[PDB]
Amino acid sequence: ADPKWELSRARLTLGKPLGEGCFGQVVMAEAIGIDKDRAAKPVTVAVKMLKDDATDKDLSDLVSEMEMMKMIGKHKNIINLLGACTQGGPLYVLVEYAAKGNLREFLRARRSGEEQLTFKDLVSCAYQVARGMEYLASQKCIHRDLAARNVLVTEDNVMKIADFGLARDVHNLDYYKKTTNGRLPVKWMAPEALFDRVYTHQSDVWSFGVLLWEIFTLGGSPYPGIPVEELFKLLKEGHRMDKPANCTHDLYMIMRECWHAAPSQRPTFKQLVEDLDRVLTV
Ligand SMILES: COc1cc2[nH]nc(-c3cnn(C)c3)c2cc1C(=O)Nc1c(C)cccc1C
Numbered sequence: 215a216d217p218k219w220e221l222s223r224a225r226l227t228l229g230k231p232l233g234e235g236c237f238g239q240v241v242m243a244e245a246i247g248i249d250k251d252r253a254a255k256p257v258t259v260a261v262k263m264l265k266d267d268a269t270d271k272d273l274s275d276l277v278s279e280m281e282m283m284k285m286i287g288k289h290k291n292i293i294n295l296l297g298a299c300t301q302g303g304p305l306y307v308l309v310e311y312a313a314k315g316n317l318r319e320f321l322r323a324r325r326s327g328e329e330q331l332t333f334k335d336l337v338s339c340a341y342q343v344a345r346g347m348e349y350l351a352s353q354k355c356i357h358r359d360l361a362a363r364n365v366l367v368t369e370d371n372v373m374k375i376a377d378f379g380l381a382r383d384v385h386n387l388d389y390y391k392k393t394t395n396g397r398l399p400v401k402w403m404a405p406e407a408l409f410d411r412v413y414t415h416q417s418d419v420w421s422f423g424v425l426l427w428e429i430f431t432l433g434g435s436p437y438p439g440i441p442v443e444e445l446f447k448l449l450k451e452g453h454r455m456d457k458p459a460n461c462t463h464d465l466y467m468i469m470r471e472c473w474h475a476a477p478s479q480r481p482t483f484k485q486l487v488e489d490l491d492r493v494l495t496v
């Protein structure tokens with residue numbers, strides 16, 4: 215047990231399930247005194263844990279994620295590590311709670327409600343995810359599955375990227391070709407990442423272009439009507455998704471630049487932050 219990060223299990227009261235994926239179950243919890251200012255204050259957290267049927271491999275993957283989160287360090291636009299329970303029973307990894315839930319569901323709830331998102335709100339969403347990715351790229355972190363389902367929204371509308379710390383071993387091609395949480399992850403993958411079986415910051419920038427298209431369609435599912443067995447041949451032939459309705463030329467330019475066939479011709483995350491900042495300023 216690393217004493218910097220260890221929390222007593224007695225400080226943690228597990229609450230309701232928040233969701234489940236290929237990489238673990240996430241449950242809501244109250245953690246007492248995880249805020250150093252007030253060692254008796256309850257703070258709501260999310261706890262990542264293994265499913266009951268988990269293997270030793272699954273455990274090593276969750277441990278690898280926890281250790282990777284420690285190495286990467288804190289940023290406003292990522293789901294930060296807050297602590298762990300590593301001795302005395304099942305591995306619990308405590309991470310930030312995001313009260314408005316995932317970005318894809320947030321956008322879909324705002325197609326036809328009173329909480330209509332403005333253009334500026336949507337550009338702010340994209341800007342914040344670009345800032346979190348710029349940070350991750352500066353720490354040599356490659357996400358490998360950037361998508362709006364993998365971004366969380368706090369009570370203050372801060373965007374936080376989740377599941378950036380996963381091992382490459384869990385991002386086998388079986389993960390990308392099976393449905394999880396209402397999506398087929400291969401539809402966010404850069405063509406060369408599929409073909410060469412290696413991921414880079416440039417393949418993450420491709421996935422960011424798909425995320426940007428998700429934002430401006432208010433949570434659309436990518437490549438509407440195209441069979442997944444036909445997609446990558448169409449991408450090689452130069453097929454790209456059309457401009458979302460009401461999207462400006464500036465934002466669609468950014469999407470199209472993210473999807474350049476040559477990885478070296480894509481913007482970096484640093485450039486994307488500047489480009490999205492320019493849109494906010496104008
Ligand atoms: C680390 O992951 C999370 C951290 C979280 N912090 N707070 C919340 C949360 C959600 N709803 N409210 C109210 C608070 C939250 C959810 C996740 C999450 O949904 N994980 C996930 C799953 C389960 C499946 C597929 C993909 C992913 C990224």
Ligand SMILES: [Cl-]
Pocket residue numbers: 396397398399401435436
């Ligand atoms: Cl999909």
Ligand SMILES: [Mg+2]
Pocket residue numbers: none
């Ligand atoms: Mg440019």
